[PDB]
Amino acid sequence: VSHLSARNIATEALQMKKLHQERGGNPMLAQQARRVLFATSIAGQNLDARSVALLLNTAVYFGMESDAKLVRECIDYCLKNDKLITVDVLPIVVTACATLKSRDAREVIEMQAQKAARNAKFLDAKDVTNIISAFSKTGINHEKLFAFLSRRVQTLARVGEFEAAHLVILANAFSRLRYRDKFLFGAIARRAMSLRERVTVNELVPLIVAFSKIGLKDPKLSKRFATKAMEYVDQMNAEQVASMFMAFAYFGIRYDQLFGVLTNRAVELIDEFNAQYISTTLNAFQRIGINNPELFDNLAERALAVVQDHDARDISKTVTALAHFGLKDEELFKRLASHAASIADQFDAMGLVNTAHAFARTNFLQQDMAVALSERSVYVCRLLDAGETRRLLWALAKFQVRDPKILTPVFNRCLALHYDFFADPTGSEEIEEIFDFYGPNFCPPLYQLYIS
Amino acid sequence: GYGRWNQASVMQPETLLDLSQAGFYEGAANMVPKAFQLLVSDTAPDVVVSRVNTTAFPGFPSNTECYTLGASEKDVAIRSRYSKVLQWCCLNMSNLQMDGELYVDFGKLLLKPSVMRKNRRIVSSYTLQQRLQVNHPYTWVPTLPESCLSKIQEQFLQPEGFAPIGKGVQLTYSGTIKRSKDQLHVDLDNKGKVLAVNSAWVNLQTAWCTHAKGPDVRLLLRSRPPIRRQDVELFASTPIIKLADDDVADVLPPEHGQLVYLSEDETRLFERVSDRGVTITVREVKRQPLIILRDEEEDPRVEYSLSAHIPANAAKATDVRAVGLTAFELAGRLAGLVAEDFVREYGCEAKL
Amino acid sequence: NPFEKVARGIAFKMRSKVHKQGYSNTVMAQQARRLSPTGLLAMERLT
Amino acid sequence: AISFAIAAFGRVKYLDKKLFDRFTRWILDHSKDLNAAELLLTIRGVSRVMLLNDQLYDDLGSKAAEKVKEFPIESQCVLLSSFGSLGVEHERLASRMVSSIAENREELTDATKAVDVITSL
Amino acid sequence: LHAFVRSPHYRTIPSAGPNGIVVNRDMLVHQFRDFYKTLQHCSLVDKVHLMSERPSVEALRVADQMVSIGATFLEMPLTGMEHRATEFMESMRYVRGAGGPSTLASYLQDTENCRCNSGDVVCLPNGIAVGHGPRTNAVAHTTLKQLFEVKDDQFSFDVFTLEQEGDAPPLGDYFGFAGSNVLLTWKDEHGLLAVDQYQQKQPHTEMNVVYLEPGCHFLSFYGVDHTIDVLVQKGYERSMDSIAAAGLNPIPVQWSEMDKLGISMRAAVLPLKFFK
Amino acid sequence: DFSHITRNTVWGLWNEGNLFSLSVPELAFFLQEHCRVANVDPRAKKSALVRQVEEILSAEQQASATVPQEDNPHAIVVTDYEEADEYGDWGAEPGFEDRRELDFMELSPRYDPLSPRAFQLLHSETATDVGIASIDPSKLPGQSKVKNALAAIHVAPNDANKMRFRMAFEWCLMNIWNMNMPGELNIGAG
């Protein structure tokens, strides 16, 4: 008996999104948009392709899922009316129906893939990069589509037709998509190389990150990227410092001069360190092996200041990295142990066993974390692999834990996987330790299996 | 029709449409996020990675590129999934500033012919779980044969810590009221005085772990919604029931609501504390329904119940999953012990 | 601390996912809308 | 107090659903007895809140087309722009209403209003 | 304002084209990218799109399919072009990729018997010119008389049927036109004949004429926009001075090898007008 | 006032834009207990209390609900260098069961060698398929009028494997008959 004009509603929603995004985002605009859009309902009106994609985009932006009536009504008219979708409105719909968990939200994407596979040839640069960016987030792995789009990108990159803003998008989308090709990445690198002095640091670091994320590559490419990184170190903050430092570590090439200049310039912005990404820059050293102690002490001095920010992964990685180059400074270690004990509720199996192994390595054992980690181990002992199970068992052995409810499941698991447990030579000494610490009484099957 | 209708004011550009909606979020049904589980024993919905040494194959004899599949155990997957879902649900409930309790009940599961379709007998577990979430066609009826109490006490009650506390064979009444918007539950004393007036239960985590020919267990997590204490005080002066020499009658005024289900309960209690502050409580109810509304409750029913208590502080100190694991472990024992008489002389469970 | 913020966001998103326009709630409402077998003949008698 | 309220609501875009439904039902029940200078006060108010009703707009358009001489020039322009904004169409209203704006052309402030009327039409 | 070109095929490019002079396969590819850059900078075309690769080198002629006279298009008749009709299909896609189908020249393609070539029809301010010779019939001129003709004080549009000899090249090759009443013509018999034929028609045009040495390929378009620029081959130097003396900025481009191939400016690009 | 007014109730009222449907003592109690304000004059009318409650609620709200539906450079992330919903437990996936019967096989939308058009992994020890069977619930206290009732029972893996195999085989037979290619079947050991 009364509806809302969906076209003008879409226009108002577009204006509301533009105002919310560019001003800071007070929740009033979000609630206003949700209240307006909840009553909206596509009906016997005749909305064209644009007026449906706009509404779907705004609705998903403002925090709506398949629960809402509008989203369910808008995911249709795409199941049944497929020819209406054009290249201009394809990425909007494709990236709108990505985080949706509905089954019907995964069929649409499939259709779109087909309608892109035969049309990856007749596109310009902007359409190609928009479509690639839209399809990156969904998670599909249609090989023919990716091959066609890679060809088209290679053809377009022969004569300069990409501004210094779409190379980042293309490289990031391909790297996240987990698809590797020497020719495409070489062409992208060459095109980025041609636009000299146009690419700023803010547009250079993401390219390095994307290329490093697919680090299974060959030299002479990171060699040239080292040269460009020389002059872009001055006007960049700690975030890109740490990110590109991890990227260069993952490249696997020793850049003595680049590492030296990075160390020289990094100490000025030690104050900007929020202690959240200190884990990555600490772990990258362990990844490569550089043992410069000056910046290590500088990093360790900025720890007690910021520990609350530290998360479970951050603490685990930091302690694992500090295992090598063992300062064993008790003042940081007590506070870190207590903080991780508080956080110890949320953790990860593999992370659990590295944390226990590092704590046993550092020879600093206090009752609280010891008992807490021993309690939380049982829930994850089920899925650990051979060496990881061995490390956890030795961690309990160092912890002096005799509770049958803790040792029984791990002993059962190692009994069920004795062949791989006893086949590790590098860890051999470790198994040695465990039995001569505990004794022969616990698991007689393990007794005569070892004695064999 | 006044005030210079021919001079329309200049309409400001900073006007965006706004709507007012009332009652959209409020309601007992739309209160908290929910979850569901449908678990059948003797299952193994998982595959195990393994590798072998294949040195007798001409062509690619290296074992690095060798991958093989293997089977797994039955209970571990079920227990892990149940514990993970319980942990997530309890974390959410504690995040919403609410209190709740764990519940364990013994009985049987019955399904309407709606779930079955096209004379199929093998259905995916995911498909069944998704199909039992649209119309709720399950018809669970709690029951347990009474000719097992001799061996019920011989279940390691005392060795575990279960002891008989309080006064047994207590007589009470349990009734429910259907108000204009919600439902209320009332506990009446043997005399007729109301003991407690609470709100309808809401189930956050549902688990329906079935079993063999014996009884199956339906572990649950519950929360209690708030209630105006004005209504609590109001349902204490107006009489609800009148107890004659033999018969009982309803006197509730029509303006206050309606009596829809009332029954007589004979209760006794047992308690255990396992050196951890957890209170595992066993209760007995040999209920005989008196005033019924629906049709499928007209029979005497004796049933068991296990319970614990998880206040709104387990998100930081108390290990929630341990209580659930213990309850699931000790429910299987009582399921096994009464499995025989559940099918021998009373009951028939022809699973084929 | 970031994990606590993530947990708060996820919990409140899941809470906001539940309202009166849900698919399951609509299904139960329409199930309640269904008339009884005698309801049809009662409407015919009224007509 | 219905036309005044509708205009006050539509001048600030605070449409209330059920209240507006009852308002529309009332003004549909008694519609043949609405004096001039009140159709103009309700059409703008109900069109600035983006309500797409067919019967209500049909009735209001017919009533406004019946009484044309009472509406002055600026009222004519605003009444045309109100229908024009949403996208609803009415042949009788436009045909009967552009004649007055054509005959009284010389009283327009300038040609900008003329091109605005043409666009809205 | 929309221009389409096609990249050459490196594997199937033939040496020693139909003039007895060998060609360098690499040099074509080297020069094509510089031509692309000049075309996209020369401010004569709004957009340039890079067509995909195809085996046949005769497919490098993007033109000779479809001519833009106004908001509408005109497809060319299928007469002797059937052997490559398939690739024609592909071309249209790119056009439709960023443009509408317009009239599809239903009126022109299905005009009983048709003989038309892109280059016989050249637009002019309030005028159309059809090069009646060995490529275009009088039926096409009558059809254009029916379609693109309006006569009034302000609805003034005219069509000129220009006579030429049998051995003359297509009309748009030698005598062209550039904005602001400047008319470019070869200084040969064909150009003089065309200039005289135009002069006998509509004396009130007042069209200045600039002469170029014969054998020069140049590209110039009326366009909805007004611009002072021309594309000239980087060969004969005197033509550049002759055209620059009149106030027109020339832009040189290298087409030696492709000239030996036999490919002209008119067929190297496909001009189009796209509207809303 | 009393205990019925909680954080969830006020949050819902705030999100539905109906905070004024509350009494002054309720708002005063909410400000004095939940928001933890210093003190409130017991004279302020509805507007001041509503504005104060609203500002306090908005200021302390920091969990962003919007998800950016756009592409943006300059953003650095280190993450790579459904699982909960895989078991289908945290809700009812809308628009389910309304699809072609392709649950037992993986079909994705011409000739190509070494390109399986339909894959179906199978196992003998492990089978993810439950079964149903009939029972007589007449004994049970309350089901004294229903004669048939289905219960979930586990099944032998071999029967489920055979059922999936024949379900795929009928589809393959129909497809190959529609195409009418020369049909061959191979059963290889290895």
PDB file of C-alpha atoms in Angstrom, chain A residues 20-21 27-28 31 34-35 57 60-63 66 72 79 95-96 99 101-104 107 110 114 130 133 137 144 165 168-169 172 175-176 178 202-203 206 209 212-213 239-240 243 246-247 250, chain F residues 11 14-18 54-55 57-59 61 65-82 85 87 92-100 102-103 107-110 112:
ATOM      1  CA  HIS A  20      30.231   8.545   6.231  1.00  0.00           C
ATOM      2  CA  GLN A  21      33.473   7.476   4.546  1.00  0.00           C
ATOM      3  CA  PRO A  27      27.817   5.559  14.082  1.00  0.00           C
ATOM      4  CA  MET A  28      24.824   7.890  13.573  1.00  0.00           C
ATOM      5  CA  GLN A  31      22.300   3.587  12.028  1.00  0.00           C
ATOM      6  CA  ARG A  34      20.444   0.813   8.211  1.00  0.00           C
ATOM      7  CA  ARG A  35      17.075   2.202   9.320  1.00  0.00           C
ATOM      8  CA  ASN A  57      27.078  -2.298  -2.607  1.00  0.00           C
ATOM      9  CA  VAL A  60      26.963  -4.703   2.196  1.00  0.00           C
ATOM     10  CA  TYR A  61      29.127  -1.694   3.069  1.00  0.00           C
ATOM     11  CA  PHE A  62      26.867  -0.682   5.964  1.00  0.00           C
ATOM     12  CA  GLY A  63      27.100  -4.096   7.644  1.00  0.00           C
ATOM     13  CA  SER A  66      21.869 -12.523   3.831  1.00  0.00           C
ATOM     14  CA  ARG A  72      18.097 -11.635  -0.280  1.00  0.00           C
ATOM     15  CA  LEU A  79      20.635 -15.464 -10.523  1.00  0.00           C
ATOM     16  CA  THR A  95      33.131  -7.821  -4.779  1.00  0.00           C
ATOM     17  CA  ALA A  96      29.771  -7.218  -3.091  1.00  0.00           C
ATOM     18  CA  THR A  99      31.989 -11.964   2.183  1.00  0.00           C
ATOM     19  CA  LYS A 101      28.219 -16.882   3.283  1.00  0.00           C
ATOM     20  CA  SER A 102      25.041 -17.892   1.437  1.00  0.00           C
ATOM     21  CA  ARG A 103      25.111 -20.698  -1.113  1.00  0.00           C
ATOM     22  CA  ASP A 104      23.340 -18.484  -3.661  1.00  0.00           C
ATOM     23  CA  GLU A 107      26.744 -19.476  -7.528  1.00  0.00           C
ATOM     24  CA  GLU A 110      30.678 -18.762 -10.801  1.00  0.00           C
ATOM     25  CA  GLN A 114      32.318 -17.539 -17.111  1.00  0.00           C
ATOM     26  CA  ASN A 130      39.099  -3.615 -11.571  1.00  0.00           C
ATOM     27  CA  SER A 133      40.866  -6.807  -7.954  1.00  0.00           C
ATOM     28  CA  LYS A 137      39.015 -11.369  -2.767  1.00  0.00           C
ATOM     29  CA  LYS A 144      41.505 -20.295 -17.813  1.00  0.00           C
ATOM     30  CA  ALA A 165      48.406   3.220  -9.290  1.00  0.00           C
ATOM     31  CA  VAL A 168      50.140  -2.131  -7.120  1.00  0.00           C
ATOM     32  CA  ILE A 169      46.563  -3.402  -7.400  1.00  0.00           C
ATOM     33  CA  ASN A 172      48.712  -7.458  -4.876  1.00  0.00           C
ATOM     34  CA  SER A 175      50.088 -12.401  -5.135  1.00  0.00           C
ATOM     35  CA  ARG A 176      47.117 -12.904  -2.804  1.00  0.00           C
ATOM     36  CA  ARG A 178      48.459 -17.511  -5.178  1.00  0.00           C
ATOM     37  CA  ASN A 202      54.031   5.005  -0.582  1.00  0.00           C
ATOM     38  CA  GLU A 203      53.435   3.353  -3.972  1.00  0.00           C
ATOM     39  CA  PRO A 206      53.369  -2.480  -1.548  1.00  0.00           C
ATOM     40  CA  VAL A 209      55.598  -6.726  -0.382  1.00  0.00           C
ATOM     41  CA  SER A 212      58.113 -10.983  -1.796  1.00  0.00           C
ATOM     42  CA  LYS A 213      54.898 -12.803  -0.855  1.00  0.00           C
ATOM     43  CA  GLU A 239      55.438   0.676   9.178  1.00  0.00           C
ATOM     44  CA  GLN A 240      56.929   0.417   5.693  1.00  0.00           C
ATOM     45  CA  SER A 243      57.240  -4.409   6.172  1.00  0.00           C
ATOM     46  CA  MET A 246      60.481  -8.550   6.324  1.00  0.00           C
ATOM     47  CA  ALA A 247      60.022  -8.615   2.540  1.00  0.00           C
ATOM     48  CA  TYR A 250      61.964 -13.312   2.681  1.00  0.00           C
TER      49      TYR A 250
ATOM     50  CA  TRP F  11      21.819  -0.959  23.021  1.00  0.00           C
ATOM     51  CA  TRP F  14      19.622   2.993  20.761  1.00  0.00           C
ATOM     52  CA  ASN F  15      19.990   1.072  17.504  1.00  0.00           C
ATOM     53  CA  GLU F  16      16.259   1.287  16.798  1.00  0.00           C
ATOM     54  CA  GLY F  17      16.225   5.024  17.551  1.00  0.00           C
ATOM     55  CA  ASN F  18      13.593   4.851  20.288  1.00  0.00           C
ATOM     56  CA  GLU F  54      23.681   8.976  23.667  1.00  0.00           C
ATOM     57  CA  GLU F  55      27.036  10.784  23.703  1.00  0.00           C
ATOM     58  CA  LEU F  57      27.290   5.345  24.234  1.00  0.00           C
ATOM     59  CA  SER F  58      28.660   6.693  20.947  1.00  0.00           C
ATOM     60  CA  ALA F  59      32.022   7.723  22.421  1.00  0.00           C
ATOM     61  CA  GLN F  61      31.617   2.481  20.761  1.00  0.00           C
ATOM     62  CA  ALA F  65      30.780  -2.539  11.790  1.00  0.00           C
ATOM     63  CA  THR F  66      31.366  -1.299   8.232  1.00  0.00           C
ATOM     64  CA  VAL F  67      33.363  -3.400   5.764  1.00  0.00           C
ATOM     65  CA  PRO F  68      35.070  -1.400   2.974  1.00  0.00           C
ATOM     66  CA  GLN F  69      33.602  -2.526  -0.356  1.00  0.00           C
ATOM     67  CA  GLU F  70      36.303  -0.827  -2.422  1.00  0.00           C
ATOM     68  CA  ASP F  71      39.928  -1.100  -3.527  1.00  0.00           C
ATOM     69  CA  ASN F  72      42.580   1.148  -2.011  1.00  0.00           C
ATOM     70  CA  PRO F  73      46.383   1.258  -2.398  1.00  0.00           C
ATOM     71  CA  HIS F  74      48.944   2.388   0.231  1.00  0.00           C
ATOM     72  CA  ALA F  75      47.578  -0.336   2.552  1.00  0.00           C
ATOM     73  CA  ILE F  76      50.242  -2.663   3.966  1.00  0.00           C
ATOM     74  CA  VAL F  77      49.219  -6.046   5.382  1.00  0.00           C
ATOM     75  CA  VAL F  78      51.154  -9.168   6.405  1.00  0.00           C
ATOM     76  CA  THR F  79      48.655 -12.022   6.790  1.00  0.00           C
ATOM     77  CA  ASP F  80      49.303 -14.829   4.294  1.00  0.00           C
ATOM     78  CA  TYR F  81      53.070 -14.646   4.841  1.00  0.00           C
ATOM     79  CA  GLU F  82      34.536 -20.762   6.544  1.00  0.00           C
ATOM     80  CA  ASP F  85      30.988 -22.834   8.928  1.00  0.00           C
ATOM     81  CA  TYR F  87      30.626 -28.139   9.622  1.00  0.00           C
ATOM     82  CA  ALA F  92      20.854 -21.962   8.974  1.00  0.00           C
ATOM     83  CA  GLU F  93      22.444 -21.070   5.628  1.00  0.00           C
ATOM     84  CA  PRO F  94      19.673 -19.240   3.747  1.00  0.00           C
ATOM     85  CA  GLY F  95      18.759 -20.577   0.336  1.00  0.00           C
ATOM     86  CA  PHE F  96      19.930 -24.143   0.935  1.00  0.00           C
ATOM     87  CA  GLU F  97      18.709 -27.401  -0.629  1.00  0.00           C
ATOM     88  CA  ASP F  98      17.487 -25.392  -3.646  1.00  0.00           C
ATOM     89  CA  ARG F  99      20.169 -26.723  -5.975  1.00  0.00           C
ATOM     90  CA  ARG F 100      20.776 -29.617  -8.342  1.00  0.00           C
ATOM     91  CA  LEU F 102      25.368 -32.643  -6.990  1.00  0.00           C
ATOM     92  CA  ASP F 103      26.285 -33.161  -3.337  1.00  0.00           C
ATOM     93  CA  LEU F 107      31.131 -30.359 -10.948  1.00  0.00           C
ATOM     94  CA  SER F 108      32.570 -27.149 -12.389  1.00  0.00           C
ATOM     95  CA  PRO F 109      31.217 -25.350 -15.498  1.00  0.00           C
ATOM     96  CA  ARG F 110      34.751 -29.183 -24.826  1.00  0.00           C
ATOM     97  CA  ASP F 112      40.682 -31.462 -23.007  1.00  0.00           C
TER      98      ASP F 112
END
